[PDB]
Design a binder for this molecule. Sequence first.
Ligand SMILES: NC(=O)c1ccc[n+]([C@@H]2O[C@H](COP(=O)([O-])OP(=O)(O)OC[C@H]3O[C@@H](n4cnc5c(N)ncnc54)[C@H](OP(=O)(O)O)[C@@H]3O)[C@@H](O)[C@H]2O)c1
Ligand SMILES: Nc1nc(=O)c2nc(CNc3ccc(C(=O)N[C@@H](CCC(=O)O)C(=O)O)cc3)cnc2[nH]1
Ligand SMILES: [Mn+2]
Length: 159
Amino acid sequence: MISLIAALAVDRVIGMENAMPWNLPADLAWFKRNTLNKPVIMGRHTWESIGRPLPGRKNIILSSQPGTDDRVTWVKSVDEAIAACGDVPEIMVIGGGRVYEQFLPKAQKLYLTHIDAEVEGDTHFPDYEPDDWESVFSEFHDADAQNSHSYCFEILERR
Ligand SMILES: NC(=O)c1ccc[n+]([C@@H]2O[C@H](COP(=O)([O-])OP(=O)(O)OC[C@H]3O[C@@H](n4cnc5c(N)ncnc54)[C@H](OP(=O)(O)O)[C@@H]3O)[C@@H](O)[C@H]2O)c1
Ligand SMILES: Nc1nc(=O)c2nc(CNc3ccc(C(=O)N[C@@H](CCC(=O)O)C(=O)O)cc3)cnc2[nH]1
Ligand SMILES: [Mn+2]
């Protein structure tokens, strides 16, 4: 099965100038929890924004160009990316915008964090049809001393 995981600010903004302007340790812990010991697929720009391999995960990078780092796996198409994951129960697609758009039609599950932040971005999560999805988990958290915005963890499954 293919799953997308993403954190969305207001108006589905997910990035600006190849960074995530906010800082929510609780959300990154949620990301780690849900991706550890699974393959993660990302686009080249997201790979460059993270800046190093994610430990405890098979890192698969999509690029039309040859690889530049043998600590991770490089692939040249969506189908190759999926194949490189091997026979696993769950493949995690971790962005960015252009990668999300391509994998969304193939995905069975969305792990979404809705962040109460107004950020002017240049990258958005794709505009998905709500009728195709059912919410099976929702958990809201107020801002605290560590997390500067309120946020909601949601898991959607394709109906
Ligand atoms: N808030 C979140 O949850 C979240 C998560 C991830 C990323 N981001 C943010 O999203 C932004 C980056 O997203 P982005 O849309 O600009 O770029 P991206 O999706 O991360 O990567 C785009 C690149 O992936 C490569 N590639 C993509 N699709 C391919 C395909 N079908 N076949 C072969 N190669 C392919 C291309 O690399 P080449 O040009 O080398 O061919 C393309 O330029 C950043 O701001 C980042 O911080 C946010
Ligand atoms: N929900 C969600 N939040 C995110 O911020 C997020 N970010 C990306 C891509 N960007 C990044 C940037 C940094 C790290 C990162 O340093 N992760 C650490 C967490 C460290 C910790 O647990 O405190 C990791 O090991 O996973 C991951 C993804 C993709 N999906 C996401 N999904
Ligand atoms: Mn059903």
